[PDB]
Amino acid sequence: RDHRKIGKQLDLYHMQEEAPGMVFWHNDGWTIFRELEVFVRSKLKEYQYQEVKGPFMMDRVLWEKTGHWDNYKDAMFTTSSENREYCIKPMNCPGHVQIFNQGLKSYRDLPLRMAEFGSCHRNEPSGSLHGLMRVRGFTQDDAHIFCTEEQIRDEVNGCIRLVYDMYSTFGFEKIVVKLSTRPEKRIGSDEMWDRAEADLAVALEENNIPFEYQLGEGAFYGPKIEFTLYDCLDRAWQCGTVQLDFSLPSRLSASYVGEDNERKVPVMIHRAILGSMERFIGILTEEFAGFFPTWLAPVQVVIMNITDSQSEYVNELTQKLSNAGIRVKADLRNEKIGFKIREHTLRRVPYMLVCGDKEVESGKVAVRTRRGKDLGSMDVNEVIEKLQQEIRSRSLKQLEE
Amino acid sequence: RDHRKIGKQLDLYHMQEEAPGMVFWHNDGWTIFRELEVFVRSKLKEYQYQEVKGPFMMDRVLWEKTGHWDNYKDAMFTTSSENREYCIKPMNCPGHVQIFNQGLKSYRDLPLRMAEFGSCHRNEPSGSLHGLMRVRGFTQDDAHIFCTEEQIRDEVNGCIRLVYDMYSTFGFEKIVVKLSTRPEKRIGSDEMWDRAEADLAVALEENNIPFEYQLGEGAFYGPKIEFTLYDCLDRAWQCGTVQLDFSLPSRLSASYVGEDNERKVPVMIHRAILGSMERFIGILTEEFAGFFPTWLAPVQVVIMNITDSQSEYVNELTQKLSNAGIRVKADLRNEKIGFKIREHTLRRVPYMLVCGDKEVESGKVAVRTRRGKDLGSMDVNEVIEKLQQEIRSRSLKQLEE
Ligand SMILES: C[C@@H](O)[C@H](N)C(=O)O
Ligand SMILES: [Zn+2]
Ligand SMILES: [Zn+2]
């Protein structure tokens, strides 16, 4: 259950000194990352989020208008062009405000939900770098909600539901919650936080979610809720965050005309469910011990022949599953069937279809799982239907288990 | 047909002084970008390419070894960390070779086609920047094919086929081809350049493709076949590029075991079809004058009620088309129906479905196209099926045209 070892055995990715903390995603590891994105996007559509994409660098001047330069200066990568300094973005927040600032906004537009899978970089100390868990280049399932204070509570409940919704898909049911409160050095009236923290606590209650407080550990711009997952070895992983922000929209001159024909500054919610996706893949790799559920498996099916006499039939079936949207590969090597099955099992390929003369004659396939299960012979289309259903529902378990 | 104006008009994207030559994709523009991406991926699958993701930056020492520092220094953004210098990548090739170098390779593994939607940055002179066509930050529909010298003919032919294939999807049939030869500043011997230039010249001749030389315009590492397409305004746009490289693999220590079990350096073919996603979207915007084919349209269908009477029916139908994979929006504003239809026509929404009391009891919808054509009352499932077919075939024309 070490993701670094598994990542090498399954040829998912690799790292090297020429790019500390920046993942070289191989075909198979990138397939998992892309399927995660597909999954998140399905939630974006469901919970009604826009998806945008911001540039990787912006003038040091704009970053200074946020405050990110005092708190993050030491973690930002800077570069330049024609005598102007630019910072490689360490977060997507400012960029999303720039998008909001384009076009007159009114209460009729709020709540405005803006998501993005945009890579960020932080010049983390090389010594603290570790596999997919602590990196310099990372992509969070980031989003920002611009709303009025009268919408906050409903928005937080929206994020709450999404959290448990996504976590349950990967089998994570044990979730600990912590609501960090007002720190000594903050930006806002004690009155403000009273309402802010109230919103967070009431929202957690409307969902019956026990929680503890991390007194004085909120950000200077607002209180927050963090969700910590527990994997099968009972290890905790903080991944979810719902951060209220009462100072960023103001510093970047964001505003809208309220129903009271006046000009107000929207409230900004920062939320991420999985957190760093590179890290999340590392957590799942260890949680599944490399046995990724079929919807995430780099290669879902390998079809193999006994002798080069079923080769033609194997290719035929490989095209069918492929056209069916299944990640399938044909193993026509000159190796014994047991050698092939052993290899694909070690690679954790969910299903293996064996094709001997018997299967060719009947137009069926002998089905086996990576768990050593004999699933009998099946018609090609029965297999395809069963697999599409397992993939579509993102089922954690295979056929028969 | 000014992509800059259309882009602001349809809320596709925007640029600002704090990040010159770098695009902010708004929801609708990003939707187009993502659909293009889905299209390219359908081709990567059909043409048998792997898809990977490399690091955003790599050690300057790596770039010195490739020759990029000596021949490409001016175009590169640099940054540092822990007394080390890093170049934000201007190209994806070196990263692809690093991935290639992980794990022993044999002739059995070739040709190995490795694609990436590579985020690249080139510090282009500010004065030469222009909308989406000339930018500093872009996304290349890049790939590198690692092959033997004997496979060069077939692999180059594959890239050539891929160029005409993809361009035809967008209605670009008039294509002019050119061969850019050895530049003043280059790496590799005159013998290697003679051979690489001849291989490409012969590939064009064998394909009976007339061409003209672009003397001294090759890449510092190899000659290239460049493809220029023409839009409906008979304007020329250079986009596609196929490059033959006998230098970078050797310099980056790439090798594979030949059939004669001898160690060999693989040949590397570089190719991008669209060039950059950004520029291609700029071209498409002018080509279609904002009237994006349905598969690309940000919002494919807008459903409108007349009065509150039909609000319930509209919500139901929208929910229904959305489940059918169609990008749909309901417009229940208390506005005259014509005002609504006008606004959406202005937005180039392919189809507008109007619902009056009649449609509601009828269980149908009144269909109008953004070109102002009246398609009459249609069964809801009939439109859904027809829209799905138009989207799936990536057709350039709407119902009735
Ligand atoms: C096409 C791509 O692979 C090449 N390196 C280029 O940027 O020109
Ligand atoms: Zn944020
Ligand atoms: Zn290249």
From Swiss-Prot, chains A, B:
User: Residues that bind AMP, according to the entry?
Assistant: 122-124, 135, 138, 140, 238-239, 276, 279
Please give the annotated consequence of changing residue 122 to A. Answer: 700-fold decrease in kcat for Thr activation, 1000-fold decrease in kcat of aminoacylation, no change in KM
Per UniProt, what does mutating residue 238 to A do?
Wild-type Thr activation and aminoacylation
Residues the record lists as N6-acetyllysine modifications: 45
Q: Where in the cell is it found?
A: Cytoplasm
Q: Where does tRNA(Thr) bind?
A: 68, 84, 107-108
* Region ranges (Anticodon recognition): 294-401
One GO term in the molecular function aspect is:
mRNA 5'-UTR binding
Q: What is the effect of changing residue 224 to A?
A: 35-fold decrease in kcat for Thr activation, 570-fold decrease in kcat of aminoacylation, no change in KM
Summarize where tRNA binds, as residue positions.
72-76, 122, 134, 221, 243, 306-308, 334-342, 348, 354-359, 368
Which GO terms are recorded in the biological process aspect for this UniProt protein?
negative regulation of translational initiation; regulation of translation; response to antibiotic; threonyl-tRNA aminoacylation; tRNA aminoacylation; tRNA aminoacylation for protein translation
Q: Which GO terms describe its cellular component?
A: cytoplasm; cytosol
Q: Which residues take part in binding Zn(2+)?
A: 93, 144, 270
The catalysed reaction is: tRNA(Thr) + L-threonine + ATP = L-threonyl-tRNA(Thr) + AMP + diphosphate + H(+)
Q: What happens when the gene is disrupted?
A: Essential, it cannot be deleted.
What changing residue 248 to M does, per the record, is: Confers resistance to borrelidin (BN); KM for L-thr is unchanged, KM for ATP increases to 163 uM, KI for BN increases to 7.8 nM, supports growth in the presence of BN
Cofactor: record remark: Binds 1 zinc ion per subunit. It helps recognize and select the amino acid substrate, and thus has neither a purely catalytic or structural role.
Q: How is it used?
A: A number of inhibitors with high affinity for bacterial ThrRS and less affinity for human ThrRS have been identified that might make good antibiotics.
Provide this UniProt record's keywords sorted from A to Z.
Acetylation, Aminoacyl-tRNA synthetase, Antibiotic resistance, ATP-binding, Cytoplasm, Ligase, Metal-binding, Nucleotide-binding, Protein biosynthesis, Repressor, RNA-binding, Translation regulation, tRNA-binding, Zinc
Q: What is the effect of changing residue 93 to S?
A: Does not complement a deletion strain
Q: List the disulfide bonds.
A: none
Q: Of which family is this protein a member?
A: Belongs to the class-II aminoacyl-tRNA synthetase family.
Function, as annotated, reads: Catalyzes the attachment of threonine to tRNA(Thr) in a two-step reaction: L-threonine is first activated by ATP to form Thr-AMP and then transferred to the acceptor end of tRNA(Thr). The rate-limiting step is amino acid activation in the presence of tRNA. The 2'-OH of the acceptor base (adenine 76, A76) of tRNA(Thr) and His-68 collaborate to transfer L-Thr to the tRNA; substitution of 2'-OH of A76 with hydrogen or fluorine decreases transfer efficiency 760 and 100-fold respectively. The zinc ion in the active site discriminates against charging of the isosteric amino acid valine. ThrS is also a translational repressor protein, it controls binds its own mRNA in the operator region upstream of the start codon. The mRNA region upstream of the start codon has a tRNA-like secondary structure; mRNA and tRNA compete for binding to ThrRS. ThrRS represses translation by preventing the ribosome from to mRNA, and tRNA(Thr) acts as an antirepressor allowing fine level control of enzyme synthesis. X-ray structures prove that operator mRNA and tRNA bind to overlapping sites in the protein.
How does the record describe its quaternary structure? Homodimer; binds 2 tRNA(Thr) per homodimer, each tRNA contacts both monomers and makes specific contacts with the anticodon and acceptor stems.
* Comment text on domains: The protein structure shows 2 N-terminal domains, the central catalytic and C-terminal domain. The C-terminal domain recognizes the anticodon region of the tRNA while the acceptor arm is sandwiched between the N-terminal domains and the catalytic domain. The N-terminal also contributes to the precise recognition of tRNA(Thr). The editing domain encompasses approximately residues 62-224; when it is removed the protein mischarges tRNA(Thr) with L-serine.
Protein name according to UniProt:
Threonine--tRNA ligase
**Protein species of origin:** Escherichia coli (strain K12)
The organism's lineage? Bacteria, Pseudomonadati, Pseudomonadota, Gammaproteobacteria, Enterobacterales
Q: Which gene encodes it?
A: thrS
